[PDB]
Amino acid sequence: PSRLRKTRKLRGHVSHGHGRIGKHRKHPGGRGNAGGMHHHRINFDKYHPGYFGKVGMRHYHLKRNQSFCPTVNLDKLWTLVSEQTRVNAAKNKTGAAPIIDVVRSGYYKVLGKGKLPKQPVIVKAKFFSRRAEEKIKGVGGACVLVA
Amino acid sequence: SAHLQWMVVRNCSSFLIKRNKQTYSTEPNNLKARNSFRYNGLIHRKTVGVEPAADGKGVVVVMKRRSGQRKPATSYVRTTINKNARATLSSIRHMIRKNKYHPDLRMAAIRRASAILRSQKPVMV
Amino acid sequence: AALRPLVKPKIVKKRTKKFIRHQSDRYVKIKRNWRKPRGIDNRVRRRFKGQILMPNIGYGSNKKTKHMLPSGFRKFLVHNVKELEVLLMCNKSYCAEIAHNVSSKNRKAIVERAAQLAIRVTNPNARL
Amino acid sequence: GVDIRHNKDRKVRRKEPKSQDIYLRLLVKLYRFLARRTNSTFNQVVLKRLFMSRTNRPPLSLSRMIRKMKLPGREGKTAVVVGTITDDVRVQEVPKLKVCALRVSSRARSRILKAGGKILTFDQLALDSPKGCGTVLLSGPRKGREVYRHFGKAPGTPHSHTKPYVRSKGRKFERARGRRASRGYKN
Amino acid sequence: ACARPLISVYSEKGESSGKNVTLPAVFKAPIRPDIVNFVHTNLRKNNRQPYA
Amino acid sequence: KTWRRWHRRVNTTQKRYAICSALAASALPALVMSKGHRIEEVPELPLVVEDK
Amino acid sequence: MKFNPFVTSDRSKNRKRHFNAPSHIRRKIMSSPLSKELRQKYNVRSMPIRKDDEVQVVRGHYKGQQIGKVVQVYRKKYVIYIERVQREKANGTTVHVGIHPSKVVITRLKLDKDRKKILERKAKSRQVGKEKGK
Amino acid sequence: VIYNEDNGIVKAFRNIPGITLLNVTKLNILKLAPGGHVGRFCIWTESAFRKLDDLYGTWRKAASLKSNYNLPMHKMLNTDLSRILKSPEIQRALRAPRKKIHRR
RNA sequence: CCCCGGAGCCCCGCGGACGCUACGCCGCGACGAGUAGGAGGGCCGCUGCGGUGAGCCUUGAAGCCUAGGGCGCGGGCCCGGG
RNA sequence: ACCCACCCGACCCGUCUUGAAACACGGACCAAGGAGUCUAACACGUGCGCGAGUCGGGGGCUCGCACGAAAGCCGCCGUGG
RNA sequence: AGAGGGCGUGAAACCGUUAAGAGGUAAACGGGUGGGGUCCGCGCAGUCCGCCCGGAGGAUUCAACCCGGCGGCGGGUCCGGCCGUGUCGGCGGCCCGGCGGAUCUUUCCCGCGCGGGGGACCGUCCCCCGACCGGCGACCGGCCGCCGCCGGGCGCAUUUCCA
Numbered sequence A: 001p002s003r004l005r006k007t008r009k010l011r012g013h014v015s016h017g018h019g020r021i022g023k024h025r026k027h028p029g030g031r032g033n034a035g036g037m038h039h040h041r042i043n044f045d046k047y048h049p050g051y052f053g054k055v056g057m058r059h060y061h062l063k064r065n066q067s068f069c070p071t072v073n074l075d076k077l078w079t080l081v082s083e084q085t086r087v088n089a090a091k092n093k094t095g096a097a098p099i100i101d102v103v104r105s106g107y108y109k110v111l112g113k114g115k116l117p118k119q120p121v122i123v124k125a126k127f128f129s130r131r132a133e134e135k136i137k138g139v140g141g142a143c144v145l146v147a
Numbered sequence B: 001s002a003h004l005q006w007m008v009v010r011n012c013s014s015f016l017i018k019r020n021k022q023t024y025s026t027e028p029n030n031l032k033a034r035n036s037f038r039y040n041g042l043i044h045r046k047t048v049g050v051e052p053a054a055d056g057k058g059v060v061v062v063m064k065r066r067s068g069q070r071k072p073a074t075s076y077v078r079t080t081i082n083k084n085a086r087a088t089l090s091s092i093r094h095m096i097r098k099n100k101y102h103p104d105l106r107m108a109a110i111r112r113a114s115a116i117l118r119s120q121k122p123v124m125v
Numbered sequence C: 001a002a003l004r005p006l007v008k009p010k011i012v013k014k015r016t017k018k019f020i021r022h023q024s025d026r027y028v029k030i031k032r033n034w035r036k037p038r039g040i041d042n043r044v045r046r047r048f049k050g051q052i053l054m055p056n057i058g059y060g061s062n063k064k065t066k067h068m069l070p071s072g073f074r075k076f077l078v079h080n081v082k083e084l085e086v087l088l089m090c091n092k093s094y095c096a097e098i099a100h101n102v103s104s105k106n107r108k109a110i111v112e113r114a115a116q117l118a119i120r121v122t123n124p125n126a127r128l
Numbered sequence D: 001g002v003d004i005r006h007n008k009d010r011k012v013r014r015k016e017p018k019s020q021d022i023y024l025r026l027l028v029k030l031y032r033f034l035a036r037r038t039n040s041t042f043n044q045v046v047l048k049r050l051f052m053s054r055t056n057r058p059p060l061s062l063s064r065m066i067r068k069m070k071l072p073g074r075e076g077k078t079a080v081v082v083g084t085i086t087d088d089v090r091v092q093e094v095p096k097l098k099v100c101a102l103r104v105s106s107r108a109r110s111r112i113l114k115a116g117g118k119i120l121t122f123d124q125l126a127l128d129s130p131k132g133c134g135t136v137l138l139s140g141p142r143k144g145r146e147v148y149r150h151f152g153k154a155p156g157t158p159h160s161h162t163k164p165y166v167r168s169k170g171r172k173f174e175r176a177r178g179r180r181a182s183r184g185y186k187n
Numbered sequence E: 001a002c003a004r005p006l007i008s009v010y011s012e013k014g015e016s017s018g019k020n021v022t023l024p025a026v027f028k029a030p031i032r033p034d035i036v037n038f039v040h041t042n043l044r045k046n047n048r049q050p051y052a
Numbered sequence F: 001k002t003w004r005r006w007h008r009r010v011n012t013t014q015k016r017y018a019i020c021s022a023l024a025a026s027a028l029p030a031l032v033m034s035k036g037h038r039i040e041e042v043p044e045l046p047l048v049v050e051d052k
Numbered sequence G: 001m002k003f004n005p006f007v008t009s010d011r012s013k014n015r016k017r018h019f020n021a022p023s024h025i026r027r028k029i030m031s032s033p034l035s036k037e038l039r040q041k042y043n044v045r046s047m048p049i050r051k052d053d054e055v056q057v058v059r060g061h062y063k064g065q066q067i068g069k070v071v072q073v074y075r076k077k078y079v080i081y082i083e084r085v086q087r088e089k090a091n092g093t094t095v096h097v098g099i100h101p102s103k104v105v106i107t108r109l110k111l112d113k114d115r116k117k118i119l120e121r122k123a124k125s126r127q128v129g130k131e132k133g134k
Numbered sequence H: 001v002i003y004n005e006d007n008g009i010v011k012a013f014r015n016i017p018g019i020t021l022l023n024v025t026k027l028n029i030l031k032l033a034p035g036g037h038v039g040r041f042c043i044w045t046e047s048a049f050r051k052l053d054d055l056y057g058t059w060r061k062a063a064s065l066k067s068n069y070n071l072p073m074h075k076m077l078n079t080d081l082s083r084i085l086k087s088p089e090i091q092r093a094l095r096a097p098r099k100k101i102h103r104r
Numbered sequence I: 001c002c003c004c005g006g007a008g009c010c011c012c013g014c015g016g017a018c019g020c021u022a023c024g025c026c027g028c029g030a031c032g033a034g035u036a037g038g039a040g041g042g043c044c045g046c047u048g049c050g051g052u053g054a055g056c057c058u059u060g061a062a063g064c065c066u067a068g069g070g071c072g073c074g075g076g077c078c079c080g081g082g
Numbered sequence J: 001a002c003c004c005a006c007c008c009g010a011c012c013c014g015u016c017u018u019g020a021a022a023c024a025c026g027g028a029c030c031a032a033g034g035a036g037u038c039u040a041a042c043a044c045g046u047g048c049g050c051g052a053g054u055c056g057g058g059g060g061c062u063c064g065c066a067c068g069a070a071a072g073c074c075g076c077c078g079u080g081g
Numbered sequence K: 001a002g003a004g005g006g007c008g009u010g011a012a013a014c015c016g017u018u019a020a021g022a023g024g025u026a027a028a029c030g031g032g033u034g035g036g037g038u039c040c041g042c043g044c045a046g047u048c049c050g051c052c053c054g055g056a057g058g059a060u061u062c063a064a065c066c067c068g069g070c071g072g073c074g075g076g077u078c079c080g081g082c083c084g085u086g087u088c089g090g091c092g093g094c095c096c097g098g099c100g101g102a103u104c105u106u107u108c109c110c111g112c113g114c115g116g117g118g119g120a121c122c123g124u125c126c127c128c129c130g131a132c133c134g135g136c137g138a139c140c141g142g143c144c145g146c147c148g149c150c151g152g153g154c155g156c157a158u159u160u161c162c163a
């Protein structure tokens, strides 16, 4: 809507909201990101630290297929499995201990953030965190690897 | 309900009329013709309307029935008063008074009724 | 006799002349419609002595007498006969105004219907 | 001539909601009347928080609602939130609740109605308690948005923990001169 | 759930017969003309041919 | 230019919400007369007719 | 409405196809309705007009009940010249005032074999259409 | 006019000026609310008025023809605020007004 | 030691506008300069589109002129004559 | 509101400027055209829907396209952001 | 042709003529007035009326009050029935209902350890009478109170119109 833009309220105003002394010239300070080390140095220091320089090694043919490792926490662990599986828990005089296949749900590594409810599980994942394994063995579960 | 459809109707109704600083409303059963929440007959559960008769003599009074919503054919009932005009004002006053039928429209309907009474006579020489 | 309004206040007006535009006396392309001076050195803009005056908010008429005719009514532009019953409950304070594009065939019907409904028309004797 | 500094003569607070939504305007009308008639401050706070914007009424989470309502003393109490009630999937048990809100999501609504609680609206809350008795007025995390992580003290500055506006994070987009002691200076 | 009345089914000449269907909750869905105007004026731009 | 952003896509839930509000205000004859439809002899405003 | 996407239905394009039509299409555009007796006798709604057809003038300043023979059909200006539909100039000479054939009804046709087979084809098409509508 | 199946209703309400035909599963916002104004006079059929419940459902039932869609919820249920404010449960707690106009 | 379908009152806890487009109406108090600039309201103006006015019109549309009647602080607008 | 008469005031508009009526610049007069737009990336604020989810991109199924190159839908309702 | 072969309407700048006014501080402008003109609104007095009441002139009917019919509002012990929500009862529909499940069973069947259809289980949507709380504006049929309309009895101290 050009009906509601600013160029309608500036009809009659001479400098069109861009100043009388210093006019709206074409490119007063260069085009784009001009002047990195010079005359924009204070801006590039107090608003973009680390912008200049080399750091770290170079991995030439990188692909995300090798480094794809999606992570799930123990705080959201019963969310991947339907609710009647944990309704039918702490019953049957057995220690039922359901299996939560994490790779089936779409994650590889199980991390150890959050509180886990007191129910034994069999967590099948490709990778585990040590804190996650400590929480699972403290509840009374079992960490099973899978490839 | 009523306030909901008033919030809808209050600015984008077909009977609304701006043009030179007064906002009126031209629907039937809107006596005093205001675009107000008191004077709107389409929305409310109880509705008093005052109109001139089709024959030219008398005043028809329109009462909303309450017996059915979603049914505009049987939503209103029309009566015709053609009497000696004091009984007309008294009859419409008793309609809006004794039936407890929304007494805010009472004196304004008396105004519109007696203005139609002065309308249905020879006006000049 | 004519149609009298409900109340007849004394309409006071703070200024009855037109705010003409600067140098419209000098130039023909400069119309009489007001444009605010926006120059760095303008006599009218910085309000020197004895010039044209700028329209401020202080010239505002009273809210009881704003948009009021000298007869005591307020205009309402009316196109047809169905728009005359709009002013049926407002005839003591508002008056009908027949539009320019309305033909002379139904203008007589509008005038006689407003005469029946006791509504003042500011231009009944126009076309005939 | 009088020397009033006219910079702060106009208070910039909200008088009406900027939205044009008619249900919210009817709730605004009802709490306008309750604010300028009832002597309670609950209706004024509810009206002031119905005035606010969507980024100014934050979504309140179900586990924080359970946390703030299992405080001692507030048994038989209702929880009035002037924003939205969102479900947390990482809470297991949920007690009986009495939640008043503008909008509750479908999963949180199903969880409360399965636990056996009651979910009222604001007109039902005004019919239940017009002065606001038996209420606890809650609000979600105001600084919880990602937009507040970029505010405050500027980056490229010592003792500052501000996230800079980076189009894509990684190794070579930052963490160089300005962040390394080896490349000139760090902060 | 809100109240749902019982709407009759008319024949080919008026004269409502004995068939009566309960009113859906679609007719009791809430009214927001700001959303209706938003969706209308944004879907109305889609059958609009370019000019240059 | 031809590459102006001519077209607007709305959320599917917003389009369904607006069409449910339109179906809900297809009832309520105070909203139908304020649209401008002459209604004065319509026997029932959710006008449901036969399958013939 | 029209559903065929090959039919024009455009303002300037239909005005172009009207005012730049060739002569055999101008003959079909300049068709005139028949009288009620001829419609009852032939079951033909309208026909293109010929050099020597008999014409009553239906609308215009020259409206009347006089059956006038066509002088000649002038298809450039989309007009016809009739015998008694004329007018005196300043110099006393009479010039036939043209009438558009849409304001023209035929009372008698000038029948030849081509017109007979055209009317038989149109009556057969009306019979097929009435049988399809029946 | 809202039709369910095509058996001649689209051919019938076709040259009558003003009538827009809509299928039940193919309802159009631009024809159910033309010009942005929400109300519209609609003529339903029996197999359309019964199929609306199979399109959108009630609040306690899914759409049953769509995959994942429930009906929306009201921000406020009882919108009759006149009845709400004249109910005794609020006016018992309301105070006395101050409507004496104290002029200068 | 009685009810106000009426004690009859400067107040009617019995329903409760003439005053209520609640985005409305009303009552006090203070203030009112302005370039560059910023924000808000336009029932100020142009063009085209979706709705709407059972809108206007050869018994005269748009445009144009006006020593006429006016309204709005103003942008401009409504009539009268040709 | 048209013209004339009197009293007081009253230097020609825009711009560069600390300063313009300037012996600073542009400018006979009038009619029409005429200068902050469009795409993308963002940032903040606001309006709406859903909510630890959200979005359907792209594609496919329905109507032969008057209205349409619209709309509706998807074990693709999530490959992917 | 007040459309006359570059002709639809025909503005401004500019020019001619007529009428009016003025003229030695270039012309022009703002504020305040005064005078002269072109038109507008009255007016052979415009005192404009809108109510209530009193009096002298007229007058058709009806109101006051009853009878018959129709329509409407409000409602009780909730009168009887549908309808409708919150709980309880038959877990009754569950097979004389579909769907979904990362709950079991290959005690089963079919196409060859798999897929579908069966069998239980859970969640989501329904049937019958009875009670309570809000009978809830989602509807009727009787009963009572009130209001309006039509046709008669209502002859004139009542009733209403012109001056």
Ligand SMILES: [Mg+2]
Residues within 6 Å of the ligand: A013
């Ligand atoms: Mg400025």
Ligand SMILES: [Mg+2]
Residues within 6 Å of the ligand: A014, A015, A019, A020, A023
């Ligand atoms: Mg400049």
Ligand SMILES: [Mg+2]
Residues within 6 Å of the ligand: A016, A017, A018, A019
């Ligand atoms: Mg600027």
Ligand SMILES: [Mg+2]
Residues within 6 Å of the ligand: A022, A023, A028
């Ligand atoms: Mg600059």
Ligand SMILES: [Mg+2]
Residues within 6 Å of the ligand: C040, C041
């Ligand atoms: Mg200066």
Ligand SMILES: [Mg+2]
Residues within 6 Å of the ligand: D006
């Ligand atoms: Mg200041």
Ligand SMILES: [Mg+2]
Residues within 6 Å of the ligand: D006, D007, D008
């Ligand atoms: Mg300030």
Ligand SMILES: [Mg+2]
Residues within 6 Å of the ligand: none
């Ligand atoms: Mg310079």
Ligand SMILES: [Mg+2]
Residues within 6 Å of the ligand: A021
């Ligand atoms: Mg400067």
Ligand SMILES: [Mg+2]
Residues within 6 Å of the ligand: J017
């Ligand atoms: Mg200098």
Ligand SMILES: [Mg+2]
Residues within 6 Å of the ligand: C041, J020
């Ligand atoms: Mg200067």
Ligand SMILES: [Mg+2]
Residues within 6 Å of the ligand: J022, J023
């Ligand atoms: Mg000098």
Ligand SMILES: [Mg+2]
Residues within 6 Å of the ligand: J025
């Ligand atoms: Mg220079």
Ligand SMILES: [Mg+2]
Residues within 6 Å of the ligand: none
């Ligand atoms: Mg020069």
Ligand SMILES: [Mg+2]
Residues within 6 Å of the ligand: none
């Ligand atoms: Mg121009």
Ligand SMILES: [Mg+2]
Residues within 6 Å of the ligand: J043
């Ligand atoms: Mg920025």
